[PDB]
Structure formats: structure tokens, C-alpha cells
């Protein structure tokens, strides 16, 4: 297989930037969104926790995302998922609790 065990912080992705802070992405959201549904998850790899960041109608939000000493990621008010891929994709469906469902990746792109 050769593909590491746990998610090796799959930076590669828009709505998944394990670099941004929280504001940095919220200013980015400032750029894109409006349509209520834009979002971008953040998850580094060193120490701390992840957090979903989306925008409603002009009020960026953030949702702490962590597991439960079980190994699976989740959210207090949100839900419970395996990884940010499920909590994201899932939520890509609905809000599940967010202010509003998801619709688009917010964070920036790459190069050009």
C-alpha cells in the first residue's frame, strides 16, 4: 500500500489548508462565499485541533473539530466522523448543525 497510516495531513486541497490560521481563512472567506455555503476546513499536524470554517451570509464561522479519545474525528455540537473527509463530505451534504450546509471550498487555490 505504502500510504502512511493516519491521514498524513493531506494538505493538498483547497478547503483543506493545514497552514492557514483561522482568520487568514476567514479573510479568504471574505473573498469568496456570500452564497452561504462556502467553507474550508483546517487541520495542521503538530499539536492542537482542527476546525471547520464556513461563512453564512457575511459572518464567518468556525467549528472546533476533534475526536473523543476514540480516534475518530468529530464535533461537539456538530457530529461524529472518521476523518475530515467524512465530516466534510457529509457536511458537504448538509449542515448537520452548522449555520448552513456546505456548498463550496473557500480557501485559496494553489499556484495559478
Amino acid at each position: 500500500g505504502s500510504r502512511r497510516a493516519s491521514v498524513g495531513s493531506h494538505e493538498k486541497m483547497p478547503w483543506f489548508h493545514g497552514k492557514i490560521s483561522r482568520e487568514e481563512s476567514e479573510q479568504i472567506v471574505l473573498i469568496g462565499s456570500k452564497t452561504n455555503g462556502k467553507f474550508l476546513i483546517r487541520a495542521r499536524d503538530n499539536n492542537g485541533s482542527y476546525a471547520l470554517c464556513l461563512l453564512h451570509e457575511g459572518k464567518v464561522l468556525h467549528y472546533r473539530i476533534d475526536k473523543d479519545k476514540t480516534g475518530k474525528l468529530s464535533i461537539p455540537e456538530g457530529k461524529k466522523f472518521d476523518t475530515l473527509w467524512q465530516l466534510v463530505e457529509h457536511y458537504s451534504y448538509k449542515a448537520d448543525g452548522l449555520l448552513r450546509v456546505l456548498t463550496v471550498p473557500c480557501q485559496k487555490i494553489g499556484t495559478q
Partner: peptide
């Protein structure tokens, strides 16, 4: 800073 899901 975490809205309530």
C-alpha cells in the same frame, strides 16, 4: 472562537 454547530 467556535460557532455552535
Amino acid at each position: 472562537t467556535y460557532e455552535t454547530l
